[PDB]
Amino acid sequence: DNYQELRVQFAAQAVDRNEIEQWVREFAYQGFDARRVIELLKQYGGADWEKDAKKMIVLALTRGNKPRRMMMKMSKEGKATVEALINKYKLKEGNPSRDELTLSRVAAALAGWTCQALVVLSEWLPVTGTTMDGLSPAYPRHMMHPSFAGMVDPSLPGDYLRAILDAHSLYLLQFSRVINPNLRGRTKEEVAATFTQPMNAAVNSNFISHEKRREFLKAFGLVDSNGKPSAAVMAAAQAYKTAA
Amino acid sequence: DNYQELRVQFAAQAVDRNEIEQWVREFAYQGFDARRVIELLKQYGGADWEKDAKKMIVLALTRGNKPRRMMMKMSKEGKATVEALINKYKLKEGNPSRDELTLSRVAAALAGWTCQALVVLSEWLPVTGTTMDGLSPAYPRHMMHPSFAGMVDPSLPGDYLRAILDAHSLYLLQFSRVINPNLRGRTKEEVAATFTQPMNAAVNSNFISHEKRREFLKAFGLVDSNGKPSAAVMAAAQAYKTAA
Amino acid sequence: DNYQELRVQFAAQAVDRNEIEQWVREFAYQGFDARRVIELLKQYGGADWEKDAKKMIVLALTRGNKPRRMMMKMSKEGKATVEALINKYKLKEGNPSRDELTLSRVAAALAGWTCQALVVLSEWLPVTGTTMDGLSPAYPRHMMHPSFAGMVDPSLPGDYLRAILDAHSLYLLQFSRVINPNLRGRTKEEVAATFTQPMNAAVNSNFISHEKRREFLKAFGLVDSNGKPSAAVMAAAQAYKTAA
Amino acid sequence: DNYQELRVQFAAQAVDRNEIEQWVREFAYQGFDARRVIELLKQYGGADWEKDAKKMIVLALTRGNKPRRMMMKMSKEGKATVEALINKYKLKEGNPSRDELTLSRVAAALAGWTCQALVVLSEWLPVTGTTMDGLSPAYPRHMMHPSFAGMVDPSLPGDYLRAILDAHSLYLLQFSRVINPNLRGRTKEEVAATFTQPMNAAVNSNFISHEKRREFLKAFGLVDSNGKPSAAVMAAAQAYKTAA
Amino acid sequence: DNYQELRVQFAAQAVDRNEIEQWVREFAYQGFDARRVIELLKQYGGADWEKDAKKMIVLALTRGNKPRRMMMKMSKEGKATVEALINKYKLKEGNPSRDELTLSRVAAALAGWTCQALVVLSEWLPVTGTTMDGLSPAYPRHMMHPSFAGMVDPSLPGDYLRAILDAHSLYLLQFSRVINPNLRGRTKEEVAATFTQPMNAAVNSNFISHEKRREFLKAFGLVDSNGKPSAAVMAAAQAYKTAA
Amino acid sequence: DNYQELRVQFAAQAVDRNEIEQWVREFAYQGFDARRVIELLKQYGGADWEKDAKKMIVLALTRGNKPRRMMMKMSKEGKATVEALINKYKLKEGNPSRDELTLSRVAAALAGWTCQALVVLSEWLPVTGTTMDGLSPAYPRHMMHPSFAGMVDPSLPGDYLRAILDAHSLYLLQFSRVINPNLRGRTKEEVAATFTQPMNAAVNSNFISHEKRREFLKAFGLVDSNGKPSAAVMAAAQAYKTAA
Ligand SMILES: O=N[O-]
Ligand SMILES: O=N[O-]
Ligand SMILES: O=N[O-]
Ligand SMILES: O=N[O-]
Ligand SMILES: O=N[O-]
Ligand SMILES: O=N[O-]
């Protein structure tokens, strides 16, 4: 019938904030699917899934996300362990489908442990805690993996949240440059453009509730009882502002 | 068979301004066919077309115009929703025939609702309202999509019309550079050349009467009862004049 | 027999100015073949050829030389008209053979009318008359298409002819930049190099006699009874000298 | 089988300057075989070869050395003429075998006429006489083709010869850059390296005796009765010295 | 099937420093498998393996790691020798499996001899001893191959160890740029990132005991009886600090 | 058995200077094989080999190393001579196998004569002796071919040897630029990098003994009875230092 009238009638319909925001979340960029990662770990791993996941996290943090490549530069024993992990958990490189595991995904799905492991693994990461201390004193080790974004409570007060993300970004700037010998022709802003979408996706995901995320941030020593960031976090956020 | 004479006699024929301008309008650039878009929505969607159209507008404004691509990085629920929408509405990408739907066409055909939805969607757009506010105070959220051009009454007094279009162009300028990173190095003038044709086409189209367009402008708070643009529009029109 | 003597005997033959110059003309660069264009229009079009040619000229001036592309961004009605024109006149894009019509060729073959149409179509061209007025006051609208080169009488006095071509070139510089987002790394001289060969070919063609061409230039208000260019032409030629 | 001894005895053998220089002349660069070119013209052309050769020289000087390419942008009459010439003379492009004709070879073999034709063809060459006049007053029109090198008497006194060749090189320098746009950024010295071999080859070739070459130079007004270069040559030789 | 809870319980599990560091060592980068290399040499070579290994080390240090490529530019005798070595030892290029020999692996596995051979091979290396002497006086010849890292005792006092490794890195810095010309434009820090992993891997490997490594350092004159680095090492460690 | 002990036992083996240096020589870069060149010349040429080799040397020096290409720009007679040489000696371009002749290889294998021929061929080389005199007075003609490196006695005193190679390098810098219109974006050091490996290979080859090489250098007037370079050589070496 009358198309102009239909458009006009359509414009007169409610602009429902609760409804729209639900769709935004449902349709938002998702870098990885944590619930599917953990389901697949439990599926492939049975009783061994927890111990194997810790190994895989150590592999992700100290060797990276390419299982077949790291095998080419590894001890005979280590290589056999990794081959057995690839075979058991059907591990892939890069960004495969939802139904496929990667080392990075295991690390991100279980970031509550990953971030703690970083306290131990500091001197073996692509960028060491020693280096980070040179940019910002007592740089929080818990922030030293892309996984950490899954620990950030997005409901923190505007300035606290910003401090946390800025402080984390200081690491992300260094890390991205080290793992990519191509971001040489890249400013701070240009490097950020490649890391903030996966960062923000994890910050805003529905995996681990806001309260549980903040509890982790508190237990890690990154915020106090009110969500105010620690001295170290404040220092690292300040360093990000003046970093290039 | 005297061709020079034929060329000459052809030159002696009336240059009828009325007849030629009618041909200009017939042949003019058209970005989309709003009437056909509504018809196709009504056709494919039946009783669900209205709710589906809103979802499709939210997708268009927050994720873009490529339904297959966005699905690769999305929650399981959202991926299922978009898949079904693709199958139900035979969604395509880019600029197919008038007999085919895209996400951008849905938002353009139903601009009256799209522009109200921008108020809610502000923080989630490729260029946020907060970013717009740094260029021009309280930038009108209703102007923050190419769709807005379909709400502009071309019968507005010259200076009021130009103010509306200049204010809108301030957004178009930022948005075009974000969506097409290869326009970052181009001048305002050059970027304008890439958005001006679809803008003017929607401004001057026969879809939705001038009187209804103006009443949307009045309802949105963009003009007053006497056709005069608000302070926010004037501010934004001035920012566009001195923008780079 | 003796090759050296044959070359020497050959060198002793007349260097016939009338004969050589005839060969130059016969062998010169020809961008399009106006007589073949008009023959094909009359062939394909019958009684409708004159009206259709005017439509095609309007299409060429306001949409360009790509019939299948412009159809993708056009009203349903306009698109059906163009499809019928393509089918009837076997229209092609770019530079096909002598035996093939294009919109550009129709415009150039009938430049006596095309140049007059420009007075009407000014504000709808890729570069508007408004813009040209910003570079040179009262810029002659008749000069605002590559077609105009077919109107230039090459027997005009050296300085008058130069003024006409310089004034036209001011437009050609702007036009070439607008239709080619590649001549960004191009100086005035570099842009000229791409437009002067088609310009000069048409200036020197044997289609429309020198006297008839000058009559057009006079009727257009571009020269007086002695071939002296108008004030507007003189201004535009001066602007070309200092343009970059 | 003592190879060092064989190498040694080989070194002890005469270095005969007369014998070696004879080998230099046998093996020297030859740009074209003038005798064969005339023979082929006479063969393919019969009674029409002289008139056809002149047309071919006009083509070579005003359109270039690619008969198939030039045909694509030419009048109907001219296209038919070139087609027939291609078929009658089996014209080729570039540098085929000595048993094949090109347009450039015809002009080179018949340089005595080619160079006189330059007087008439001046405004229509890739570098015009008027352009040459801006570099050196009254630049000799007879020097404005690579063909001219075949008219140079190498037995001229050193300083006269060098003046003729320097004056000619002024043209070669401009012409090489026009014909090969990728030489615009190169130094005079570098451009010289690209034209000097065919130049010297024609200067020193056995086609047309030194005495007849000199009498052409005298007839052309390039040298006087005592072998001395004209003012125009001297001027042009000096302009080449200080050219970039 | 509560995945958040599973993630949470996983986070509550011990972060056992001893257990995690054991996993780091298992999974650590390994450049080559020295034990397997010797086994393969002994296997393929029988009674000739020792003499063949020395030839292979000389090839590695003076020609590189690509046996097929070097053969193309070599004396007849040498080409025959390398061909036979390739056939006898099944030599490969690059980084194949642990069950395959390369020239570089032979030199690395047998580093104690390789490093002594550098004294003799000095003038014939890609970076000569004389060049090293210009950067740091009497640069230790024993350090002038990546192999040297396998002679470094990691149990040396921190400052002595670092001095040995810094002195060695001065060579690694020059050598990496010569071998990979695309590293000439990179910073010291960037070049270091390309040599540090295989360096540290050999430093910390379980092949050859710390005590035997140190006694090689003492025998080579690189440290004294009290573990202290020689003047030459200290000089070279200082040159690395201020190197670009 | 015990791999660590085997490596340690291997390190305890002699580092035999005489033995190692023999392997270096056997394994060194070889650009061409002079003994194989001369054997092939004698094989293919029989009684005509010596005269044909002189022709081939003249061809190499005045036309280059591409027999099929030079034929395309040559007299009928010269071309037939070269075709007969290609057929008889199975000549190739570039760097084919040991068992294949090239013009360059004939020139280098017989450099004792080649270098003498250069005194005659000076003004016909790609870079003339006249040009070289402009860079360094009385530049030694004998040095004006890559072949000359086969004449250099590497046992000359350090400073004399360096003078000889520097003086020769002055030519090599000019020559490499002239035969390669790509080394335009190349410094002196960058050009040297392309010519020193073939230079040094020939300087250090075992073809023609040190004493015989020095005898040639003496007979050429390039060194005196003690091996001290002439004035001309000293001048040319000095010019190389300050050349760019
Ligand atoms: O990318 N979703 O954490
Ligand atoms: O082309 N916009 O209706
Ligand atoms: O290009 N001939 O008008
Ligand atoms: O090679 N010119 O006769
Ligand atoms: O990985 N070096 O033993
Ligand atoms: O490259 N051996 O002379």
Residue numbers in the entry:
A (entry chain B), B (entry chain A), C (entry chain B), D (entry chain A), E (entry chain A), F (entry chain B): 2 to 245
Quoted from the paper:
The N protein is the most abundant viral protein in the Phlebovirus virion and plays a key role in encasing vRNA in a protective coat. In addition to its critical role in protecting the vRNA and the antigenome (cRNA), the N protein also plays an active role in RNA transcription and replication, as well as in virion assembly. Here, we present the crystal structure of RVFV N forming a hexameric ring. In conclusion, the structure of the hexamer formed by the RVFV N protein presented here shows that oligomerization is mediated by a flexible N-terminal arm, which binds a hydrophobic pocket in the adjacent subunit.
& A resolution cutoff of 2.3 Å was chosen to retain only the most reliable data for phasing purposes. Hexamers I and II in the crystals of the native protein superimpose very well, but the two rings in the crystals of the selenomethionyl protein are slightly different. While hexamer II formed by seleniated N is the same as the two hexamers formed by native N, the subunits in hexamer I are more closely packed about the 6-fold symmetry axis. The domain of N that is near the center of the ring, comprising the loop connecting helices α10 and α11, occludes part of the central aperture, suggesting a twist in the assembly of the ring subunits. Superimposition of native and seleniated hexamers I based on subunits A, creates an 11° deviation between the planes of the two rings. Furthermore, comparison of the subunits in hexamers I formed by native and seleniated protein shows that the contraction of the ring is due to a lateral slippage between adjacent subunits. The different hexamers seen in our crystals and the variability in the oligomeric state of N-RNA complexes seen in EM images demonstrate substantial flexibility in the interaction between subunits.
